[PDB]
Design an enzyme around this catalytic site. Sequence first.
Site, PDB file in Angstrom:
ATOM      1  N   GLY A 166       0.796  -1.224   0.000  1.00  0.00           N
ATOM      2  CA  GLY A 166       0.000   0.000   0.000  1.00  0.00           C
ATOM      3  C   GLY A 166       0.830   1.277   0.000  1.00  0.00           C
ATOM      4  O   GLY A 166       0.557   2.185  -0.787  1.00  0.00           O
ATOM      5  N   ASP A 167       1.893   1.330   0.845  1.00  0.00           N
ATOM      6  CA  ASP A 167       2.807   2.485   0.929  1.00  0.00           C
ATOM      7  C   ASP A 167       3.525   2.698  -0.408  1.00  0.00           C
ATOM      8  O   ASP A 167       3.685   3.843  -0.837  1.00  0.00           O
ATOM      9  CB  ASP A 167       3.889   2.283   2.010  1.00  0.00           C
ATOM     10  N   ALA A 168       4.004   1.593  -1.031  1.00  0.00           N
ATOM     11  CA  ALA A 168       4.676   1.638  -2.322  1.00  0.00           C
ATOM     12  C   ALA A 168       3.718   2.130  -3.407  1.00  0.00           C
ATOM     13  O   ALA A 168       4.110   2.956  -4.228  1.00  0.00           O
ATOM     14  CB  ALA A 168       5.219   0.259  -2.683  1.00  0.00           C
TER      15      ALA A 168
END
Lengths: 334, 333
Positions: free
Chosen positions: A288-290
């Site tokens: 999700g962060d990527a």
Amino acid sequence: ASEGVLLGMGNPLLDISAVVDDAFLTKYDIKLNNAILAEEKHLPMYDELASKSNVEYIAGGATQNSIRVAQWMLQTPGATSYMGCIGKDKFGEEMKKNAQAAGVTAHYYEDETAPTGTCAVCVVGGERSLIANLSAANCYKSEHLKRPENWALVEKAKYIYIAGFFLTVSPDSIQLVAEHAAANNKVFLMNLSAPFICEFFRDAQEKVLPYADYIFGNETEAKIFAKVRGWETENIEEIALKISQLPLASGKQKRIAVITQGADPVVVAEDGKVKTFPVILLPKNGAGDAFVGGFLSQLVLGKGIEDCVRAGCYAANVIIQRPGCTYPEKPDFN
Amino acid sequence: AASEGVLLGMGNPLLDISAVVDDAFLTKYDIKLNNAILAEEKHLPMYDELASKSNVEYIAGGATQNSIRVAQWMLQTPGATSYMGCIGKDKFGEEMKKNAQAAGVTAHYYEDETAPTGTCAVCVVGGERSLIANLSAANCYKSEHLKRPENWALVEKAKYIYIAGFFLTVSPDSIQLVAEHAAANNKVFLMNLSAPFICEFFRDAQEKVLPYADYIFGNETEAKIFAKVRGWETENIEEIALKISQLPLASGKQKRIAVITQGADPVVVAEDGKVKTFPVILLPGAGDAFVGGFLSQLVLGKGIEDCVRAGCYAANVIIQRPGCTYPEKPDFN
């Protein structure tokens, strides 16, 4: 991309990633595919991982991971900035070292007593076990932000991304930069992340939402968000549309809501309409962060939503095939 | 009668600084009523102005401590209650010690060496309130304080130990230690669903303590968040209460009772696979007071209906007063 064009603020954690065996997992009673809080029994484990030679130290935390992925994707030196709280210890100096290696301009607030936040990332195959000790990451104060050397990073930035989790740590910093962005034609972006749902958080989130040009979220977060505020729909496409149409502060023209659904398509609401994008995979934790980092990179370059989504999926697909939120030297995205 | 330290609470204590305010004060500090705000530091001009008021009051607050004080008031037996939490080495910490002693609660606070004591400005007008909280030392509790013999003696003394779910964000080792101790020594361990967790780190900590909870308290919004977070498709509070009561049980625990309030609507209680519902009876931050009244009757070995009625009595008294305050003696039967 101009100097410090993108800024992130959050809860930084030094990720201590290492490939481990059954003996190590049994020793600290940790199971794979689960993220737990560090207890007194797990605190000496950070020493054992530090004592290994093949250990990878990364300037982590959800927002910082997104900023590093955006920097890697952009490849332009000095394009990114980051602010957050660390402690005065060796793990804080490692966080400074890795942020500099990743090409991110990090101005950390150093708490006088709290040790730097850490996260043991124990890898076996394609599985991880996260043991986090948040510690200093929860002690950020707006006095750091208001210093001229740190406020210059807000002044430089055209895009400022802050996770919703930071509404429990420093809501004065979020409101200050969100209000500044609306008054100075800057883009403010946030996510639906939250450690818990309390009256203090609810009210602080309600006060910042009118200032969000972009809101990122996952299907579970979007469905909690909808249920908390009384929306009876459970359809993620309709929830994304309702998020995009929340009240808008003065000086904010439109809002775009981006909701990921794992394997299922990325949902994007804009101009009263919902467009859905199937996930495209590469040949054959932190995903999700990527995704957000890849999306932010193309947003900084003035590219369209489809390029933003494809870059997000590209970065997410690279990071899942690597231990922790790590990546190769240069990207290969078009 | 209630024995010495029969009931213990552990939490995040805040010195509540309560006062009746006017429109000029609310406008001056840009404060909205029926709102809870988290402050990074004490707004010193506001604290001095609040202190300078005529009807100002300093109460040993925080949700769990409020419940313990209300239970102590309801019991009227000296020495029946205990409390542990973190404070700072300052005047507000000494005021916290003073008010806990005035309320008749045996408080063994952990004193952080650098963090100031947690405070909460309670600005009251009519039947509405605005809270401005600076948690500070309340988030610095360490299990080393709990493990000291003089503080662990309070756990040993207690038959009922109550801790909010939110305290897992401060010291999950203290919660797990007392929850496991209670299961091994025939003690009752009670929790609430306050601040329902969304983050995986906090969800895993809660999953580890739930098997040890003999009682779980919650309100309708918390119960519905809890149910949605863990994938339960039901939105009916009566069925959610039953599903909470039937969560997995740890060794040395035979049953769980789930108590869910619904404001004006009835109190929902799940026990032995059945759900009983109790209409609210009226008198001629109420949730903490409800729990305190319930705990008082539970300590006296009374039935669930008496526990619910005492909870409603305490909640109805506290709502008619500024902050979580009460008269000298209770009048409940």
